[PDB]
Design a protein around this ligand. Structure first.
Ligand SMILES: C[C@@H](NC(=O)[C@H](Cc1ccccc1)NC(=O)OCc1ccccc1)C(=O)CCO
Ligand SMILES: C[C@@H](NC(=O)[C@H](Cc1ccccc1)NC(=O)OCc1ccccc1)C(=O)CCO
Lengths: 302, 299
């Protein structure tokens, strides 16, 4: 066993759910599960509308015939519509036989998921990312990628956690869950909203340092330990998220796999933050990586 | 602003992965039409010190191979060896067979790997064939037979995984069963040679940066190819050839920045570092995006 990669879930179960939704001159992606298509509600909006849209008002002026849904080049007739928070739910007259076992999950900041980038209902690529502490994603989404989704897979069950809606002024991305509720304080209208202060996901950096040790990188270890409190006093000065006992407990399995006490790994991290990596690498990286969860590491190394 | 290395969507390949078990050895196979392709060392144990594969395969019958496609057993009705692969004929043509071709990839080129265990896909990631004919993968026990691929409109299979080398990098074959590099499927002293940075791809990534609006590193100067190679080779970069300069033609056209002018920018970056700044959000020069990747993503 060797190597460590930013790995995404295989995307096939999600590929079979992607469709195109068109309303007026706006086209974006939808998610087709059973007899329902989910997509961002701003598909119904004019540029003037975006604006200061009242979505109940804009929606009541649609019918079913206002929505063109296509799987490939085959139209799916819309037989009903409704809004749920910032999503539209379109009922179509055919069921998708490729619908996987699935659920809708609202993820927490710091958690990771795979994104299937799509344009015009066609999968383009797949990548793994993390939900930042500030509820943005550092994604890769070009014009027309709205409605692309984020997901995890436990065996044969797909947990959908993200649907893409917008790009913020800093070039980061924002998004709803599959109940249409935004992650973070963002709204689907044209206003001067901005990504909040972000932090490094400490739990994930510690996970990745465990990954390095599993992979044979130990140069950053030392003979010291720390208390949680003393660690946080240091880490917080470097814009790291405060580390809690729950996070310490989460790292349990990896500490037992490697035989390095969590607080001894925290001591290593403290040293790296204070002294840097002059100019060495960990798992080939020159920076401390924070987009692998403890669970991610356990999965990839076990 | 917002660049990610992406893998191809893996669904077309997932539909082709099966489990192949021969005795106590299980690995993955690729089921296309009525043939399953897998590493020939599925028939091996100790054998791996000096395997006479012909002889070992003499003592197997079709019945020796258990192939499992999800919950279904595919009856093996024929078997043969082709270079370092077994080809098992099965009684069922894969209903999920995509349009496909087998290609042999060149050093520096990229592909997506679908990591599989027990015939079940577990993850997908993008990687490059290193100049030393290895890949820097992530593979656990049981991953043998996992495949690498690109998709164009058509799935081009380019890699099948066979082994881990002493430094933790990975070696495998094309889909005709010929190894990339000098490696052999037996237990030797074999080791990866020294590797270099993939200059062509670093240049590609700098063009990507420019296309995306990150252009602080550009200057008003140029270099000859030879003078660039004198400098770059000191930093363990692959020598740049006139063929590589041509491959960057479309990106150079698109941006209006001559290749040798971009080489002048890279030379300054190598000789002076980034002085704090980042390129495409990175603090290092990325070498696993090809010119074709850049074009594909930025369209
Ligand atoms: C349907 C399309 N939606 C947009 O363009 C959204 C609509 C919107 C949502 C919420 C608040 C304001 C505006 N606009 C939006 O994200 O505006 C900024 C932007 C920056 C960079 C690239 C593209 C766009 C897409 O497919 C966007 C994908 O980039
Ligand atoms: C069936 C399995 N194959 C192996 O273990 C192959 C068999 C082999 C192929 C070619 C030459 C010699 C030996 N062995 C192999 O890769 O040995 C090197 C190694 C393995 C594990 C940890 C460290 C080093 C796999 O699933 C390979 C994936 O790990």
């Amino acid at each position: 066993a060797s190597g460590f990669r930013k790995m995404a879930f295989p995307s096939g179960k999600v590929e079979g759910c992607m469709v195109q939704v068109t309303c007026g001159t706006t086209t974006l992606n939808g998610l087709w599960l059973d007899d329902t298509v989910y997509c961002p509600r701003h598909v119904i909006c004019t540029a003037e509308d975006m604006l200061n849209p009242n979505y109940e008002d804009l929606l009541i002026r649609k019918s079913n015939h206002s929505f063109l849904v296509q799987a490939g080049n085959v139209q799916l007739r819309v037989i009903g519509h409704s809004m749920q928070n910032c999503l539209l739910r379109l009922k179509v007259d055919t069921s998708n036989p490729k619908t996987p076992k699935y659920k809708f999950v609202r993820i927490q900041p710091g958690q990771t998921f795979s994104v299937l980038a799509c344009y015009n209902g066609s999968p383009s690529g797949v990548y793994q990312c993390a939900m930042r502490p500030n509820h943005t994603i550092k994604g890769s989404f070009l014009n027309g990628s709205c409605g692309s989704v984020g997901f995890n897979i436990d065996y044969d069950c797909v947990s959908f956690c993200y649907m893409h809606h917008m790009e913020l002024p800093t070039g980061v991305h924002a998004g709803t869950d599959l109940e249409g509720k935004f992650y973070g304080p963002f709204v689907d209208r044209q206003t001067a909203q901005a990504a909040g202060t972000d932090t490094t996901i400490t739990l994930n950096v510690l996970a990745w340092l465990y990954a390095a040790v599993i992979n044979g990188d130990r140069w950053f270890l030392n003979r010291f330990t720390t208390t949680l409190n003393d660690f946080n006093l240091v880490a917080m000065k470097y814009n790291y998220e405060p580390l809690t006992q729950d996070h310490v407990d989460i790292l349990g399995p990896l500490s037992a796999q490697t035989g390095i006490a969590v607080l001894d790994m925290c001591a290593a991290l403290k040293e790296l933050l204070q002294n840097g990596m002059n100019g060495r690498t960990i798992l080939g990286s020159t920076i401390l990586e924070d987009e692998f969860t403890p669970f991610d590491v356990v999965r990839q190394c076990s």
